[PDB]
Amino acid sequence: TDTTPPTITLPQEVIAYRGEEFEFFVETTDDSGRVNRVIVRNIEGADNSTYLDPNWIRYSTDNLSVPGNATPANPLRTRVYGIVPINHGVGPGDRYTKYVRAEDAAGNITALVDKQSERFVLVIRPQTEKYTPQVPTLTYVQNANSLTQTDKDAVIAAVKSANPNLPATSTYSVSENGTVTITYPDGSTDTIAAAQTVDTDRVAPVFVDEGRDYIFYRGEEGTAELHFYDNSGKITNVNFAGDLAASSTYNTLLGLGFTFNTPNINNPNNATEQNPLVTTIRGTIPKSLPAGPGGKYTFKVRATDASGLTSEAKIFRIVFANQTDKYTPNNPGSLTGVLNPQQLSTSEKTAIEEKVRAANTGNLPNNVQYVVNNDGSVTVIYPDDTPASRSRDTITADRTVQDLRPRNS
Ligand SMILES: [Ca+2]
Ligand SMILES: [Ca+2]
Ligand SMILES: [Ca+2]
Ligand SMILES: [Ca+2]
Ligand SMILES: [Mg+2]
């Protein structure tokens, strides 16, 4: 018969955090494959005692005293579990050594020896020992010695966002200098140093497109996309009317019916190097403005971050261009026969214009005009053509005309 008590396996030490649930399993086996009782108790008391305290240490064994319930491949599982009260002490003496016993169907119970038989030490620790807070991304503030409330709110936001796995009911406070104090549900705390949360914003926004020339073709609507970023990731204002000289050409463009749109200007994190703030200028330089030496508008732009640093005015230009700079006529697919190359007839000119037209649909503007000259060369006149700024192309006669005169003898 069986004279051997079951074998108990369990962790010698379980760290339990105040205000949280804890759980671990005792595993029990026996040669018979059956265990009838599994007990957790305090050391004091008679051999038959199962007295156990405090009331929040709990345990249960679902499958007691059934055959085959306690084998090496499938041991009997005893659940030890509870919730540590929020106000429990967390001194070095706030620990519990509890004794675990098991008894087989033949009545063989494991011996109970103070400080030596099967036991576990449940150690109650503050919630701050479980959690290690992650540094947030830095908040760039006007004055790292005296944070505003919006500064504080932002630091809390970046702490939370970087620490999703802290207890949801944790509370955050930010000092006048940005030092973060995290208070856990049990009142224990953690600190994130001011050096790790904030710095004073010392860098003004950057205009990526400084010095750039944006070409606008006369009579064709165009766009110019200007890009800006800031070390803080955030720009609050973009300004083109810094001084009189810059403000007058800005207002000149607006009077031509241009628009300036910066749709993300009020979004947070709207201005990083990887995802810059974009201002788009849209409009048409009308043909009444000529291209040439003074055919430019020169602008100055400044950008301001949320801490009030404004960049040094930087320059960009819109440069006027004739449409002919953009287009190249295709030559006719065939030449046109002409009886006298020095003076084309009407029907010859009409036939040349048709071939040039057909050769350039989908290439030149639909509203280009062609003049077939007396020598059969062809003047291509773009819609922006004016006397002060001609926009034109010439197709030479050797590409359009073919002499039909017969050869001598
Ligand atoms: Ca046994
Ligand atoms: Ca901690
Ligand atoms: Ca800045
Ligand atoms: Ca051209
Ligand atoms: Mg208008």
Author numbering: 252 to 660
Sentences from the paper on this structure:
The serine-rich repeat (SRR) adhesins are a family of bacterial cell-surface glycoproteins containing two sequence motifs where serine constitutes ∼50% of the sequence. The binding region from S. sanguinis strain SK1 (residues 252–660 and termed SK1BR) differs from structurally characterized Siglec-containing binding regions in two ways. First, it contains two copies of the Siglec and Unique domains in tandem (SK1Siglec1-SK1Unique1-SK1Siglec2-SK1Unique2) with sequence identity/similarity of 39%/56% between the two Siglec domains and 44%/50% between the two Unique domains. The second way that SK1BR differs from other structurally characterized Siglec-like binding regions is that each of the putative Siglec domains of SK1BR contains a noncanonical YTRY sialic acid–binding sequence motif that lacks the central Thr-Arg deemed to be critical for binding in other Siglec-like adhesins.
